[PDB]
Design a protein around this nucleic acid. Structure first.
Ligand SMILES: Nc1nc2c(ncn2[C@H]2C[C@H](O)[C@@H](COP(=O)(O)OP(=O)(O)OP(=O)(O)O)O2)c(=O)[nH]1
Ligand SMILES: [Cl-]
Ligand SMILES: [Cl-]
Ligand SMILES: [Mg+2]
Ligand code: NA
Ligand code: NA
Ligand code: NA
Length: 326
DNA sequence: GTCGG
DNA sequence: GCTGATGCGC
DNA sequence: CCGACCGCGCATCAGC
């Protein structure tokens, strides 16, 4: 946690622009800056020194100068005093409440945690489960718990059919010692970019995991993306574990390396990598990397047979998952 | 809010 | 219903 | 200056 004071200021600035200002590029600006400063391996002693790194420009320069002087930023201090923005920031912490839902609720007087309980009638389903497990969803997961969760998922999956492969990605695959949640990549060989030979492929998995009582709730569920809740099982009169967020993404088996790249992340790394593809003249998503025509239209999928092939198309040296934390 | 063209 | 735009979350 | 800023799944709503 080297430059943590500066980086928390920028993350607090980014959350403001995102939740209150509804200014998604200001959000990404502060996020990039916070990311570049967090990877920089000295103690920033001046706003100008930070201005050297890309994505730290003039206005973040003044803000670093001030933070280094006072230990505060008064733009922030006053954002924290404003009760409209502080109520908006808080409501967005409920999964399913975004910036728009937050401001609407505040316009209706629903401002606090007890307000939300009074009015579970005015919530959609995702918002309800987000409120239900509001505290749990804010706890991290130690890696050790991730390892037991991995074992259940990989052993339950093997039972539905032995040809399912299931890869835990996200921060776990990047080597984190604690995780915000669990992210699971799922391949079955009967689902490729050329056919879906069997339906319910993802539904069977969600079904099996529900019946061992691992999956406990559902936020959203289509035929390739599940978004819900799980909980490790406890011993005899041991305290229950917190409930955990789990996403499971069924990707066509022949598109595994683009899928595993996407789900390993991080979100910022993905953004920077996909942006660099575009300046090199490629477009990357979770399925394919394609060349861009002389006009804008994306071409046809380039053949990929490892993660490193994707890095090589855009002329980056490969980076291990644990070096993709940005 | 930053940056590259 | 279907299509598309938006919110929200990755 | 000034526009472009990753890309997409699912839930939901408007409009036909
Ligand atoms: N292309 C893209 N991918 C994203 C974005 N957000 C998340 N992802 C991908 C990369 C993440 O590593 C992965 C899982 O999303 P998470 O929110 O769980 O992030 P991650 O697991 O890295 O962090 P965590 O420790 O769980 O909070 O999904 C995004 O805005 N764009
Ligand atoms: Cl691939
Ligand atoms: Cl594609
Ligand atoms: Mg995660
Ligand atoms: Na800079
Ligand atoms: Na939210
Ligand atoms: Na996730």
């Amino acid at each position: 946690t080297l430059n943590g004071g500066i980086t928390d200021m920028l993350t607090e600035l980014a959350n403001f622009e995102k939740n209150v200002s509804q200014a998604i590029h200001k959000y990404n600006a502060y996020r990039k800056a916070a990311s570049v400063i967090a990877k920089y391996p000295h103690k920033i002693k001046s706003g100008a020194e930070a201005k050297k790194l890309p994505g730290v420009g003039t206005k973040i320069a003044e803000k670093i100068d001030e933070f280094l002087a006072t230990g505060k930023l008064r733009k922030l201090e006053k954002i924290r005093q404003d009760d409209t923005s502080s109520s908006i920031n808080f409501l967005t912490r409920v999964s399913g409440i975004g910036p728009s839902a937050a401001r609407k609720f505040v316009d209706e007087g629903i401002k606090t945690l007890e307000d939300l309980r009074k009015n579970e009638d005015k919530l959609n389903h995702h918002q309800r489960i987000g409120l239900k497990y509001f505290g749990d969803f804010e706890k991290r997961i130690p890696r050790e718990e991730m390892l037991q969760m991995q074992d259940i998922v990989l052993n339950e999956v093997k039972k539905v059919d032995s040809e399912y492969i299931a890869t835990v990605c996200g921060s776990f695959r990047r080597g984190a010692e604690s995780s915000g949640d669990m992210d699971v990549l799922l391949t079955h060989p009967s689902f490729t970019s050329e056919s879906t030979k069997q339906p319910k492929l993802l539904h069977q998995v969600v079904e099996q995991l529900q019946k061992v009582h691992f999956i406990t709730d559902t936020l959203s569920k289509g035929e390739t993306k599940f978004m819900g809740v799980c909980q490790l099982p406890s011993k005899n009169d041991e305290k229950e574990y917190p409930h955990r967020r789990i996403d499971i993404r069924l990707i066509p088996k022949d598109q595994y390396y683009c899928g595993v790249l996407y789900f390993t992340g991080s979100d910022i790394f993905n953004k920077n990598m996909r942006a660099h593809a575009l300046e090199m003249g490629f477009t990357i998503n979770e399925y394919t990397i394609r060349p861009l025509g002389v006009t804008g239209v994306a071409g046809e999928p380039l053949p990929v047979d490892s993660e490193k092939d994707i890095f090589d198309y855009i002329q980056w040296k490969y980076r291990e998952p644990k070096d993709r934390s940005e």
